[PDB]
Design a protein around this ligand. Structure first.
Ligand SMILES: [Zn+2]
Lengths: 140, 156
């Protein structure tokens, strides 16, 4: 009934993360002091983060995360990218699980990590940016 | 034959560095793989009171300022003094490259001052270099009113 929001990358991610990936312990951390938004994710235990930063104010060590992604401060990011993200993400998680199991039984396996290919991800941004015109989700 | 080329960040920096900061110990590292250009910087000072510092007669302080492609480079912001993003091939507006040069000089001037003060002011706890974005921005603004926008691309 009474549902009305301000459309930020935050709320948008929220919604899209429950409407496309509600099966997972995918969480969100907003470090507003360091203008960053982490997508804490847990697979069942394995935990990695994905980061959104403003290169003009955020401090970051790319290595602590699977991906780092810059947004344009105030403007935020393109919907056609936040989409390509939440989709390519499922790709990486679903593909992540089928290989996470192959780590518990395949004694031939050595280390388990997640694979985020930028190339395939860029392709995802195209895949989605082919349905709607420019839309920009702002940052809080 | 001979060709003529519009400046790129690497050449432009190298050029400006020698032109405006010859008196200082400044180097460049082009990490081609990581799509990154680092400006290395060294201050020296004579140690008299044989003041006891951590880790290590003539002290040396080194630091670095990094240019990176946010779409390409992998970077630990915390390894450098500043971490300046550029726009893939587009590069950076000249005014930014220029504001950088002129602010960097300020930073090293004040740096060398603070260093000498470090070794003689028994009250000084720590010495480092200070990069105030607001002062950087102001430098850029100050140049951006001198001349007309012009971009300086990234090497190929
Ligand atoms: Zn960074």
């Amino acid at each position: 009934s009474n549902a009305m929001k301000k459309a930020t990358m935050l709320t948008y991610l929220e919604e899209q993360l429950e409407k496309h990936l509600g099966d997972y312990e995918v969480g969100l951390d907003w470090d507003r002091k360091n203008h960053t938004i982490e997508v804490i994710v847990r697979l069942y235990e394995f935990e990695d983060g994905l980061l959104f930063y403003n290169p003009q104010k955020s401090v970051v060590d790319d290595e602590e995360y699977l991906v780092t992604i810059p947004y344009e401060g105030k403007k935020g990011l393109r919907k056609a990218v936040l989409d390509g993200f939440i989709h390519y993400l499922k790709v990486v998680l679903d593909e992540g699980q089928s290989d996470l199991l192959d780590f518990l039984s395949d004694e031939t396996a050595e280390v388990f990590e997640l694979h985020w290919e930028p190339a395939d991800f860029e392709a995802m941004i195209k895949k989605v940016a082919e349905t709607e015109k420019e839309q920009w989700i702002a940052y809080p």
